[PDB]
């Protein structure tokens, strides 16, 4: 899933914005076997675009989603930023970074639109 | 999920349209554990809009849907009505009560 | 799910084109157990329409689906064809058939209706 080097980046990211706990290889194994459970292809965790796709399939369920699902989604958000080379200090910065990413492109959509 | 009173109602409602058996405490718990089985939020059973979001989430998987899914759908349907103080005597009523309130949404929406 | 003649047709189909292995009884059973797990009604498997409805539901998940889902969808693709008396030699022919119908009705109920 992660290059050693992505792993090194991963293992410094904190689970919560000021927390002492950090992401670990066990969180990737979990996320992979979780996706397996929900019949999503865990091989997808190995590229940015994979992760982008998974997040899109899970995005809709977020609202009514239990914290086991939100926990899965967020793990994959952090992974995505890691594959993307987007520097984050914790999970929330991951999610913000992804959002302000979408919001930028969806403007360029509106803006490419009137051409 | 339910206050007593709210739960008093619940416990006289019959599984069937017109059969003898009724709604246990045990069915809410089941409904809760089903939801987290489906990674859906169980705290949603605690509110009417909550049950209203769940039913909306579940409503497309229903036709093709298994007996457990349809069973989960129907008790959350009843939960909803009891929650909504829109009372009823069986599931079928609670279900017509959503088919027929949903139509009041559609006829008054556009 | 299948009737004897359907099951002769079935146990004569292969999983891959010039392939050796064909569809056993074990495949109908797995797919039935798989569907109940997916909270889908296994009794749908014994009709062309139900198989149809299961496939249209599964289809959006396919692209990011695991091999378990991909294999669930393929068995059911084949099962439909059989219920339809469509003469598909392997799974590949099964899935283009599913691909043929799924766009017929997609084009229909959007640009006709």
């Amino acid at each position: 899933v992660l290059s050693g080097g992505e792993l090194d980046k991963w293992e410094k990211i904190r689970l919560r914005p000021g927390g002492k706990k950090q992401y670990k290889l066990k969180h990737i194994v979990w996320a992979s076997r979780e996706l397996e459970r929900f019949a999503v292809n865990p091989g997808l965790l190995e590229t940015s675009e994979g992760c982008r796709q998974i997040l899109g399939q899970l995005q809709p369920s977020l609202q009514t989603g239990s914290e086991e699902l939100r926990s899965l989604y967020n793990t994959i958000a952090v992974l995505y930023c890691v594959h993307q080379r987007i520097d984050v200090k914790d999970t929330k910065e991951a999610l913000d970074k992804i959002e302000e990413e979408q919001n930028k492109s969806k403007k360029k959509a509106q803006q490419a639109a009137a051409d």
Side-chain angles (χ1 to χ4, degrees), chain A residues 1-110 112-115:
Chain A
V1 158
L2 290 202
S3 79
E6 297 188 314
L7 225 335
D8 289 352
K9 290 174 141 170
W10 184 246
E11 297 193 316
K12 311 298 180 300
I13 304 167
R14 313 180 167 299
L15 256 39
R16 296 158 268 285
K20 10 282 172 237
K21 247 60 160 202
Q22 281 153 316
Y23 274 105
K24 269 135 136 178
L25 255 155
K26 57 155 145 263
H27 294 112
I28 303 162
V29 181
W30 181 84
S32 158
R33 299 191 124 84
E34 270 286 86
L35 287 185
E36 213 135 49
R37 222 160 126 267
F38 306 165
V40 177
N41 169 34
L44 287 174
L45 289 175
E46 61 198 41
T47 63
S48 302
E49 225 271 76
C51 293
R52 190 202 76 166
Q53 271 167 42
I54 300 165
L55 293 183
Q57 243 55 256
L58 304 167
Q59 149 72 43
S61 314
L62 268 188
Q63 206 195 36
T64 51
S66 63
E67 249 79 88
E68 180 185 20
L69 174 121
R70 295 183 126 294
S71 171
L72 177 70
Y73 180 96
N74 292 351
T75 295
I76 304 169
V78 172
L79 229 107
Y80 172 71
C81 287
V82 174
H83 292 308
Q84 269 288 277
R85 262 150 148 110
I86 304 171
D87 159 57
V88 306
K89 254 53 106 209
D90 43 63
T91 310
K92 200 73 84 81
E93 186 179 333
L95 300 171
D96 286 352
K97 251 67 156 13
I98 279 161
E99 147 103 334
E100 56 201 51
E101 237 203 41
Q102 308 164 264
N103 301 176
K104 264 173 177 97
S105 90
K106 314 304 171 188
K107 264 232 118 238
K108 273 82 156 290
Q110 305 255 228
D115 288 311

